[PDB]
Amino acid sequence: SEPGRNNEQPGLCGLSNLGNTCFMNSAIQCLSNTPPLTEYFLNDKYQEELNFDNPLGMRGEIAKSYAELIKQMWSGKFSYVTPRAFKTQVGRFAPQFSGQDCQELLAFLLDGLHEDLNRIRKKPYIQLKDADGRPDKVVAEEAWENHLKRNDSIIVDIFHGLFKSTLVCPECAKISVTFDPFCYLTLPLPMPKKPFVKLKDCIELFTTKEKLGAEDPWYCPNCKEHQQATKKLDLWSLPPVLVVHLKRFSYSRYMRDKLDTLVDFPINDLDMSGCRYNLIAVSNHYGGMGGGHYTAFAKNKDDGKWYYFDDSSVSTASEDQIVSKAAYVLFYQRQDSSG
Amino acid sequence: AAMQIFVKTPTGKFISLEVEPSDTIENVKAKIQDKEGIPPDQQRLIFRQTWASKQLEDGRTLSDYNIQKESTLHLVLR
Ligand SMILES: [Ca+2]
Ligand SMILES: [Ca+2]
Ligand SMILES: [Ca+2]
Ligand code: NA
Ligand code: NA
Ligand SMILES: [Zn+2]
């Protein structure tokens, strides 16, 4: 009677390709299988928190249409749905995704869901500060409180962490320490390409002091100029769901290839800064002439099994298949306790 | 209240602007026009933060985006 309408297990629901929209379907499958987020929408907790006047929001329309899509995908009435209504809202508020990169769409959805659900209805303007010699715990706590005074949402709760940023001016040697929120991490891969690297090594690269490129200088207040400072990041506070983007497109564009390193990432028990994480979803990218193709692996919250989502098709998967060179964005969920 | 912010042009040049947190994005685009001659309808302003890359829209203020003294905005032609 209706293509796609079939009584199915909730969440085991594909997404039709609308014409080069697999970058979007792959992202949606990762977010759909982030259990604190999907449960928040299915239990209608979002209705009370929609923020229609947020000057940085999308009038609540991104959260509303995302919630309606999630409710379809988890209704049990579909083997796939066509996310036209959601795609229309995305194109309306982010026209760069019309006629792409899975990570950039993810960044936009995390931003748009946050503002559409931001509990702060009248945001104070806040002058942010650096450490000024105060202990790290004091400055981090102040930074998180300043963040929360303007940004308080289910997205902050689930996805937002903190790192410590140390910038050193090469000319006056001034050191500036700030604590800066994030909602995902982009990890570099070794250059030149290695055939195999553990995820922990890419995290180590991420927290390695690096001189800022001449294309991204940092204003030094002492020198009163933009300088190629070095920047050192330390992961300070990690969120319940950590989104880890592998920077595979590290080549200069004329090479027309990507870093196909086998990045070995844990299925279970990725340990970082005293936290233990388990994988819940992977966005894959396969190389191809027209920007390639995106798919996803995800663990279903209701049966604990892994599945493979290729646009409209959903199939069983095994975790032994998941670590491959196609892995591009990893979703990790913090374990409640350990040991 | 007055403060200095910077705009990085597509060339890589840093423009210096004198602003207040209450200034509108349209007014910021006008100040960019005054100095670079780029019409505001062609200006795309991005505020790159560690947790968001927000496109600045007409009808909001610098304050709406928590733009700080000596912040840098990226200007894209589009
Ligand atoms: Ca889980
Ligand atoms: Ca474990
Ligand atoms: Ca395993
Ligand atoms: Na840059
Ligand atoms: Na003016
Ligand atoms: Zn300096």
Cα–Cα dist A222/B28, whole Å: 26
DSSP 8-state assignment for residue A60: T
| Ligand found nearest the CA of A279 | 1
Resolution of the model in angstroms: 2.0
Does the beta-carbon distance from B50 to A180 stay under 8 Å? yes
Tell me the nearest-neighbour CA distance from B66 into chain A, angstroms.
6
**Residue-range domain boundaries for chain A:** 1-339
Q: Which helix (H) or strand (E) holds A71?
A: helix A61-73
Those of residues 32-71 in B touching chain A at CB distance below 8 A are 49-54, 59-60, 63-66, 68-70
| Ligand found nearest the CA of B28 | 5
CATH number, domain A1-339, options 3.90.76.10, 3.40.50.300, 3.90.70.10, 2.60.40.10: 3.90.70.10
Tell me the nearest-neighbour CA distance from A115 into chain B, angstroms.
11
Report yes or no: B22 at the A interface, CB cutoff 8 Å: no
Cα–Cα dist A332/A159, whole Å: 10
Degrees (nearest 5) of the Cα angle A162, A266, A245?
50
Cα–Cα dist A290/A293, whole Å: 8
Which one of B15, B26, B66 makes the best mutation probe of the A interface by having the most chain A beta carbons within 10 Å?
B66
User: What is the maximal distance between C-alpha atoms in chain B?
Assistant: 31
Experimental approach: X-ray
Reply yes or no on whether A183 is catalytic: no
Reply yes or no on whether A275 is catalytic: no
Q: Where are the beta strands (DSSP E) in chain A?
A: 14-15, 80-81, 161-168, 175-182, 185-187, 196-198, 210-211, 218-220, 225-227, 230-237, 241-246, 262-264, 270-272, 275-286, 293-299, 306-310, 313-316, 327-334
CB pairs A-B closer than 8 Å: 43
